[PDB]
Design an enzyme around this catalytic site. Structure first.
Site, short mmCIF file in Angstrom:
data_model
loop_
_atom_site.label_atom_id
_atom_site.label_comp_id
_atom_site.label_asym_id
_atom_site.label_seq_id
_atom_site.Cartn_x
_atom_site.Cartn_y
_atom_site.Cartn_z
N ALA C 99 0.81 -1.21 0.00
CA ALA C 99 0.00 0.00 0.00
C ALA C 99 0.84 1.27 0.00
O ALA C 99 0.39 2.29 -0.51
CB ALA C 99 -0.93 0.02 1.20
N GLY C 144 -0.96 1.42 5.78
CA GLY C 144 -1.64 1.59 4.51
C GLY C 144 -2.83 0.67 4.36
O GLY C 144 -3.94 1.12 4.05
N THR C 145 -2.61 -0.63 4.56
CA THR C 145 -3.70 -1.58 4.45
C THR C 145 -4.49 -1.70 5.75
O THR C 145 -5.68 -2.01 5.72
CB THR C 145 -3.16 -2.95 4.05
OG1 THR C 145 -2.12 -3.32 4.95
CG2 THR C 145 -2.59 -2.90 2.67
N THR C 179 6.58 5.49 14.09
CA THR C 179 7.47 4.79 13.17
C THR C 179 7.23 5.18 11.72
O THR C 179 7.68 4.46 10.82
CB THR C 179 7.30 3.28 13.30
OG1 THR C 179 5.99 2.91 12.87
CG2 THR C 179 7.47 2.86 14.75
N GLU C 183 2.02 8.66 9.28
CA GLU C 183 1.05 8.06 10.19
C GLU C 183 0.02 9.02 10.80
O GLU C 183 -1.09 8.54 11.11
CB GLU C 183 1.83 7.32 11.29
CG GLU C 183 0.99 6.57 12.30
CD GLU C 183 1.84 5.84 13.31
OE1 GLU C 183 3.08 5.97 13.25
OE2 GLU C 183 1.29 5.13 14.17
N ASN C 206 1.63 1.23 21.39
CA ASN C 206 2.94 0.60 21.49
C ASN C 206 3.82 1.20 22.58
O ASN C 206 4.64 0.48 23.15
CB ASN C 206 3.68 0.67 20.16
CG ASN C 206 3.13 -0.29 19.15
OD1 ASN C 206 2.86 -1.44 19.46
ND2 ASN C 206 2.97 0.19 17.92
N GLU C 254 -23.30 -8.57 25.02
CA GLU C 254 -23.37 -7.91 26.32
C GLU C 254 -22.34 -6.80 26.46
O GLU C 254 -22.47 -5.97 27.36
CB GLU C 254 -23.21 -8.93 27.44
CG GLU C 254 -24.27 -10.00 27.42
CD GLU C 254 -24.30 -10.87 28.66
OE1 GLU C 254 -23.44 -10.69 29.54
OE2 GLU C 254 -25.21 -11.73 28.76
N1 GTP Z 1 2.29 -4.35 18.02
C1 GTP Z 1 2.68 -4.45 16.74
N2 GTP Z 1 2.68 -3.33 16.01
C2 GTP Z 1 3.05 -3.35 14.73
C3 GTP Z 1 3.45 -4.61 14.13
N3 GTP Z 1 3.76 -4.35 12.86
C4 GTP Z 1 3.58 -3.03 12.67
N4 GTP Z 1 3.16 -2.45 13.79
C5 GTP Z 1 2.82 -1.04 13.95
O1 GTP Z 1 1.90 -0.72 12.93
C6 GTP Z 1 2.20 0.55 12.39
C7 GTP Z 1 2.61 0.37 10.93
O2 GTP Z 1 1.57 -0.27 10.22
P1 GTP Z 1 1.78 -1.65 9.48
O3 GTP Z 1 0.75 -2.61 9.94
O4 GTP Z 1 3.20 -2.02 9.53
O5 GTP Z 1 1.38 -1.19 8.00
P2 GTP Z 1 0.52 -1.99 6.94
O6 GTP Z 1 -0.83 -2.20 7.50
O7 GTP Z 1 1.24 -3.18 6.46
O8 GTP Z 1 0.34 -0.94 5.74
P3 GTP Z 1 1.34 -0.60 4.53
O9 GTP Z 1 2.62 -1.27 4.84
O10 GTP Z 1 1.38 0.84 4.66
O11 GTP Z 1 0.66 -1.10 3.32
C8 GTP Z 1 3.31 1.13 13.24
O12 GTP Z 1 2.71 1.93 14.25
C9 GTP Z 1 3.99 -0.09 13.81
O13 GTP Z 1 4.66 0.08 15.04
C10 GTP Z 1 3.42 -5.80 14.99
O14 GTP Z 1 3.75 -6.90 14.54
N5 GTP Z 1 3.04 -5.64 16.25
N1 GDP Z 2 -28.10 -15.70 43.57
C1 GDP Z 2 -27.59 -15.78 42.32
N2 GDP Z 2 -27.50 -14.65 41.58
C2 GDP Z 2 -27.01 -14.73 40.31
C3 GDP Z 2 -26.59 -15.99 39.74
N3 GDP Z 2 -26.14 -15.77 38.49
C4 GDP Z 2 -26.29 -14.43 38.26
N4 GDP Z 2 -26.79 -13.84 39.36
C5 GDP Z 2 -27.18 -12.45 39.54
O1 GDP Z 2 -28.14 -12.22 38.46
C6 GDP Z 2 -27.93 -10.91 37.93
C7 GDP Z 2 -27.36 -11.04 36.52
O2 GDP Z 2 -28.36 -11.68 35.71
P1 GDP Z 2 -28.19 -13.07 35.00
O3 GDP Z 2 -29.18 -14.09 35.49
O4 GDP Z 2 -26.80 -13.67 35.05
O5 GDP Z 2 -28.52 -12.55 33.51
P2 GDP Z 2 -29.43 -13.28 32.40
O6 GDP Z 2 -28.87 -14.61 31.99
O7 GDP Z 2 -29.48 -12.25 31.29
O8 GDP Z 2 -30.80 -13.39 33.02
C8 GDP Z 2 -26.92 -10.25 38.84
O9 GDP Z 2 -27.60 -9.49 39.83
C9 GDP Z 2 -26.12 -11.39 39.42
O10 GDP Z 2 -25.53 -11.09 40.69
C10 GDP Z 2 -26.73 -17.16 40.62
O11 GDP Z 2 -26.39 -18.27 40.19
N5 GDP Z 2 -27.22 -16.98 41.84
MG MG Z 3 2.86 -3.29 5.16
#
Ligand code: GTP
Ligand code: GDP
Ligand code: MG
Ligand code: TA1
Ligand code: GTP
Ligand code: MG
Lengths: 91, 429, 441, 441
Positions: C99, C144-145, C179, C183, C206, C254
């Site tokens: 890119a 770029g990408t 880098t 950017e 980073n 959720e």
């Molecule tokens: N944490 C992490 N950051 C990365 C890595 N490679 C690149 N970066 C970061 O990503 C940014 C550069 O983008 P890249 O992903 O290298 O670029 P690209 O998406 O390949 O795009 P082009 O090369 O421009 O086509 C910089 O901020 C880098 O530090 C990686 O492996 N790990």
């Molecule tokens: N007493 C009790 N409370 C629970 C339990 N599991 C979740 N809760 C409570 O239930 C509420 C969360 O809802 P939950 O039943 O997990 O969500 P749902 O699956 O969307 O209905 C919170 O107030 C939790 O503290 C359980 O096994 N026992």
């Molecule tokens: Mg690249």
């Protein structure tokens, strides 16, 4: 009736907010070594048969304002006030 | 005889329900395979209530399980008692509620309620006479708050004359395990005022309190909070299943315990709760159970009972007792606590005495009480609600599923009228 | 069964995908050639769960992964490495040129005509699954990408799928160390489609993980192998409730209900508790109150961002391993007492606890080891607005001088695209100034 | 017993006949010298079924095949190859000169005086069979004998046999790649007798199978040996129900009832599911819903023809191997939901499923391998009309210039034959414009 009337509803309300002093022919011309001309075309015949909203407000002879349908972070619609200055703002 | 259908919604619901059918089983002496191997003949007379029969001597609970969205499916099936429920009852769908009310009541609830009620009607007509529809659900959540109160809108509709008890786990003032939780309580109490005869307000903080302040448990897991709830759940229907000396149905309670048709939010207690090995320094007597039942640190609703007047209470005693010590201990409490009750009711406490204790104990009890001190459980939510709703904070995950803003103001108007009809009788006159 | 589709994009996305799929194969028992010889000894359990692994009839397991980078150099490490025979042989390379770090080559020039292979491959992959979907996108801003091609991949997947949850895990440009010199141009043009389409954007950085690898882990020279494992431990405990048996599971739907107040403030700033060394795996209790208090100090945020200069809105404590649900509420009433951990008025509930109880496993080869519990707190604070103003300032300082821009508009893109991406980020930064300020009466 | 007579014509027809009869001898167990040493071990079964194989008393087996090409160079490969002693020694060569790519040498000059050996040989072959007949004709359009001599062979077999089913499997000129410059002249003159006499004309193409041999099979240099096996796998599962024991067999008369609405729209555009590699024989489930969805994308049609720009009329899903009849209806209600797979109003039934359950076998020597199920969908769509307009345009562009035509009219044929073949194809293309358009009220 119209589906998009609400966005245009605030546009019809904005056009009474400020003072419309537009451009009339026969005014004085200053030096203006670099001029910038901006012309608005009139509404065509296809647009009114398509539900078209005029969004280009020309309030002055040196200012032009464009509105845009946007929303807040509460899904509440409002109009952005894009404020541009030209030399030469035409109706 | 009188028969009950137990429904389980929300993931809180079957987790209480899986512990519920283990307390019921050991109370009747019934193994994981449903084979009766009990001690006496006295616990076969009302197997009919919870366990309908099967072909060869096996017993199946009438347990519908609405809540088995498949993360909970193969734990309840692969549990202690997954080989006791009837496998057609495990009614569920895919893509569970998401801690959303509108995804429990309007979108996924509407495409599942037809598959539930096709099993509800097939468990009603296998019965001589029904009265009971126990719904173990919880507020705050998803399924347990939207879909749990969609069925009560339908089951009360197809059965306008059944006692509808819903053991409703409620939110807490501090323990906030759900960020959206003041929405799923306001929208569900709006349903549970209109559509239930009784509903028990249980909180987790007052269950966390008992396991520390009274039972002295080091690490109370979630099983040991449900083991306290279920000891009440098998304490309301005790006089149904077992003979006594003064019986009380689920309807002699819910005619006495409720003055006005909206004032039916209960707080349940239990006694004896104490912490021991086999050396404990006390004596199980009728005045010993009484002081613990009325004690403000052995409720479950997590409100202070001395802040308000008890409207009326019910003390469902079990074990072998004497009725003079029952009727005189219930008298002296009412006289020492003349401001703590309502003056303009003749006798507030009723008594219910069965004749069969639990398995290990000698005596037990259950304090079911209707109090104006539960105004605090509804004022806290209605302050947390109108804080979120004023900014229109989390509403686009609900109005994007079909609701309207004019149902939120309907739900807060109903909960604010309970607080008005609780502050009145808390005042003196 | 619930499942995810992990779509890595860019070189940053594929390099993280080297270690996210290295972690999954070790938890479930899957060797680097598809088999499961661990559960054959016991003879039961379907532990190669269908969340991440399609299963074929010959016992082999295939992941849900597809990755596109428009350069063969990155994926030819995967096609010749240890994980050669594991993945399906459609790891989409086909780029006759990189890119070259711009958004215009990119969203327009060579991202188009390669996207036709991409969307059809997802449709051949999404239609093998019944139930929950969720697109785990992996890219970086600034590239770029990772910036350009993801932006084309979002507006073409918000139409063919509609309302499905999209968790995209972006590496954000650091305010002090960059880098690339272009950017700041790419990480303002990629916001215009991250804001609209992807419902939940996990930003990490980073520089803030460099300090974690120096202070806590005590590694003086951390390479990119040792940074991507810490993101891999985070991504595991985000999608851990879809696999394992917990006491409070939190589905990917959720997150959307809880973490996201308004539809345009979805930027939640993940953390972790990586104080393992493992010399310091002794000398330290690491209880529930200990690992929950790791989020207090701003020396453990994964983004160079000070949470004390802003409110919180909603948090999501997600635990692992030997956690008892009682100990959690002791470690929460503590946090609601501390007066610098500041909330807004309009969210009095605060937290949400997901207790999975499968312990996090250890990748052999360093650099941490077997702790008994963990936490991945996800909290959209107001403080991320000052992390963007140190990037709009880098954009505005070289936009007045009209620098670097003839390689953006001379590749199909119009020069008016830049101010359209500035009027979002000016207005999106304006949104965080309103939400944190309470209303008075 | 039901049977077919396989009549290959041309060099294209004989070269396909190298591999159609290579496939049949391996399924039934017949060696290249007539014997059956496979079933002699078991000692039972008549598996050299009389559909394709006459049996003599000495244990040898003889096919039902006759082929005419008017050139010795093609058949002398058969008379000296591995299948020398298998066939009967009347493989009709006798051509003292090749056709030289025209229809006039051809239907008139040297096709006559050799046809007298042909029809009498079929009568000596058809009168050994009791029951169903069907002429499996094999030729190509565009060639000289595949176009010219087949046209003489159809009007002389629609008189001596009447109403017998004739399945003719024509290789159609590709719209982009043509191996002759006079191929647009021959493939418009051969339509005037394909339309009238042959009741069902399976068109395949060379460019649309080139992309299948490059994309799916991953063969970079596909020769004509590797293309004719894919047609051979198709021709096997067309006439598979006449041999093997299925749960829903489809006779050759059941094609005519179902595939063909009107008597002149019989052009049904075969497909297959050849995504075997066989490196990709792993990494992939290949269920019933998978192989049925292979017909969705227009990158697997055997004709360079886009089905999304036209309706369908009637389809015929023909399965092989381990197919359960329940899984089929899941893979059909899916297809009737998808809105680009478009039907007409006047055919609400749609499909027809023939489940044979003998698995397709593997020719040793590449290039695919043992899959457990297959599908040969046969569907006359409206989209074949745009495949002809890119061939009438090649005809009309060199008919205004009066090119190449003195070798057509100077061999007995009149120059008025060309406009008689244009007024069919103009009117036959006009038929597809009416049938796809529904009537409104
Ligand atoms: N944490 C992490 N950051 C990365 C890595 N490679 C690149 N970066 C970061 O990503 C940014 C550069 O983008 P890249 O992903 O290298 O670029 P690209 O998406 O390949 O795009 P082009 O090369 O421009 O086509 C910089 O901020 C880098 O530090 C990686 O492996 N790990
Ligand atoms: N007493 C009790 N409370 C629970 C339990 N599991 C979740 N809760 C409570 O239930 C509420 C969360 O809802 P939950 O039943 O997990 O969500 P749902 O699956 O969307 O209905 C919170 O107030 C939790 O503290 C359980 O096994 N026992
Ligand atoms: Mg690249
Ligand atoms: C030697 C002895 O007497 O031991 C008692 C005991 O020590 C105490 C402390 C028991 C004990 O209960 C608990 O420690 C407990 C644990 C989790 C949740 C709630 C309680 C006991 O475990 C519980 C057990 O309860 C029963 O047997 C009841 O029938 C009870 N059963 C169950 O809850 C049950 C447990 C496991 C499997 C199946 C059922 C019951 C109560 C109401 C309705 C139905 C059943 C009893 C009396 C004891 C032990 C064994 C130590 C106590 O509880 C109960 C329910 O009786 C706790 O306070 C009481 C007082 C008892 O004296
Ligand atoms: N698939 C396939 N196509 C072939 C083969 N041989 C020829 N063709 C195609 O058939 C067309 C040429 O017709 P041929 O069959 O070679 O010609 P013919 O029938 O011998 O006629 P004349 O040589 O003109 O007398 C071209 O489109 C070729 O690509 C073959 O073995 N396999
Ligand atoms: Mg030839």
């Amino acid at each position: 009736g119209n589906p998009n009337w609400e966005t245009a509803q605030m546009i019809r309300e904005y056009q009474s907010t400020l003072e419309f002093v537009p451009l009339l022919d026969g005014q004085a011309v200053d030096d203006h070594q670099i001029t910038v001309c901006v012309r608005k075309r009139p509404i065509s015949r296809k647009e009114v048969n398509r539900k078209e909203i005029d969004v280009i407000s020309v309030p002055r002879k040196d200012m032009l304002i464009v509105h845009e349908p946007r929303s807040k972070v509460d899904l509440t619609k409002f109009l952005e006030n894009h404020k541009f200055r030209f030399d030469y703002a035409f109706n | 005889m009188r028969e009950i259908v137990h429904i389980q919604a929300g993931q809180c619901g079957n987790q209480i329900g899986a512990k519920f059918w283990e307390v019921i089983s050991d109370e009747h002496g019934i193994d994981p395979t449903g084979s009766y191997h009990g001690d006496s003949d006295l616990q076969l007379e009302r197997i009919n209530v919870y366990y309908n029969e099967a072909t060869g001597n096996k017993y199946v609970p009438r347990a519908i399980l609405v809540d088995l969205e498949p993360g909970t499916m193969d734990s309840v099936r692969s549990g202690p008692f997954g080989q006791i429920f009837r496998p057609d009852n495990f009614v569920f769908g895919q893509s569970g509620a998401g801690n959303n009310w509108a995804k429990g009541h309007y979108t996924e609830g509407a495409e599942l309620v037809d598959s539930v009620l096709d099993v509800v009607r097939k468990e009603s007509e296998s019965c001589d006479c029904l009265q009971g529809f126990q719904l173990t659900h919880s507020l705050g959540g998803g399924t347990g708050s939207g879909m749990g109160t969609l069925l009560i809108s339908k089951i009360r509709e197809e059965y306008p004359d059944r006692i509808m008890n819903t053991f409703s786990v409620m939110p807490s003032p501090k323990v906030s395990d759900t960020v959206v939780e003041p929405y799923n309580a306001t929208l569900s109490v709006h349903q549970l005022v209109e559509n239930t005869d009784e509903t028990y307000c249980i909180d987790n903080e007052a269950l966390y309190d008992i396991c520390f302040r009274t039972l002295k448990l080091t690490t109370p897991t979630y099983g040991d909070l449900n083991h306290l709830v279920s000891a009440t759940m098998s304490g309301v229907t005790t006089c149904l299943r077992f003979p006594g000396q003064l019986n009380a149905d689920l309807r002699k309670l819910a005619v006495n315990m409720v003055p006005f048709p909206r004032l039916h939010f209960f707080m349940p207690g239990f006694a004896p709760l104490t912490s021991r090995g086999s050396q404990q320094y006390r004596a199980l007597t009728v005045p010993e159970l009484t002081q613990q039942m009325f004690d403000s640190k052995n409720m479950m609703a997590a409100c202070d009972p001395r802040h308000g007047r008890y409207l009326t209470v019910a003390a469902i005693f079990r074990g072998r007792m004497s009725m003079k010590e029952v009727d005189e201990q219930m008298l002296n409490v009412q006289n020492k606590n003349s401001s703590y009750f309502v003056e303009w009711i003749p006798n507030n406490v009723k008594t219910a005495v069965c004749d069969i204790p639990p398995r290990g104990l000698k005596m037990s009890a259950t304090f079911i009480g209707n109090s104006t001190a539960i105004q605090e459980l509804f004022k806290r939510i209605s302050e947390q609600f109108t804080a979120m709703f004023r900014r229109k904070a989390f509403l686009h995950w609900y109005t994007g599923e079909g609701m309207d803003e004019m149902e939120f103001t309907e739900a807060e108007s109903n909960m604010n009228d309970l607080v008005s009809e609780y502050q009145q009788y808390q005042d003196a006159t | 069964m619930r499942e995810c589709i992990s779509i890595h994009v860019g070189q940053a996305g594929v390099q993280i995908g080297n270690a996210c799929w290295e972690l999954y194969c070790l938890e479930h028992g899957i060797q680097p050639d598809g088999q499961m010889p661990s559960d054959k000894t016991i003879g039961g359990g379907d532990d190669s769960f269908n969340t991440f692994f399609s299963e074929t009839g010959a016992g082999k397991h295939v992941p849900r992964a597809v990755f596109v980078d428009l350069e063969p150099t990155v994926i030819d490490e995967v096609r010749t490495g240890t994980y050669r025979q594991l993945f399906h042989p459609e790891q989409l390379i086909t780029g006759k040129e990189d890119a070259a770090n711009n958004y215009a080559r990119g969203h327009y020039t060579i991202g188009k005509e390669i996207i036709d292979l991409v969307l059809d491959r997802i449709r051949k992959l999404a239609d093998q699954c019944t139930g929950l979907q969720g697109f785990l996108v992996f890219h970086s801003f600034g590239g770029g990408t990772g910036s350009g091609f993801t932006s084309l991949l979002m507006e073409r997947l918000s139409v063919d799928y509609g309302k499905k949850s999209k968790l995209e895990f972006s590496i954000y440009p650091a305010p002090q160390v960059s880098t690339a010199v272009v950017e700041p141009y790419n990480s303002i043009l990629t916001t215009h489609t991250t804001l609209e389409h992807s419902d939940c954007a996990f930003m990490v950085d980073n520089e803030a993980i460099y300090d974690i690898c120096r202070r806590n882990l005590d590694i003086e020279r951390p390479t990119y192998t040792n940074l991507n494992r810490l993101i891999s431990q985070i991504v595991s405990s985000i999608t851990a409730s879809l696999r394992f048996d917990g006491a409070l599971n939190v589905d990917l739907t959720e997150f959307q209900t809880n973490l996201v107040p308004y539809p345009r403030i979805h930027f939640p700033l993940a953390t972790y508790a990586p104080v393992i060394s493992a010399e310091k795996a002794y000398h330290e209790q690491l209880s529930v109150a200990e690992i929950t208090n790791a989020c207090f100090e701003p020396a453990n945020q994964m983004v160079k961002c000070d949470p004390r200069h802003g409110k919180y809105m909603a948090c999501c404590l997600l635990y692992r391993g030997d956690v008892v649900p009682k100990d959690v509420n002791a470690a929460i009433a503590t946090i609601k007492t501390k007066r610098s951990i500041q909330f807004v008025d309009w969210c009095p509930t605060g937290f949400k606890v997901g207790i999975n109880y499968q312990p996090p496993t250890v990748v052999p080869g360093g650099d941490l080891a077997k702790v008994q519990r963990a936490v991945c707190m996800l909290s959209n604070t107001t403080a991320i607005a000052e992390a963007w103003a140190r990037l709009d300032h880098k954009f505005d300082l070289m936009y007045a001088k009209r620098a670097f821009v003839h390689w953006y508009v001379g590749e199909g893109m119009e020069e008016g695209e830049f101010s359209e991406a500035r009027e979002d980020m000016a207005a999106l930064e304006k949104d965080y100034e309103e939400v944190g300020v309470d209303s008075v009466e």
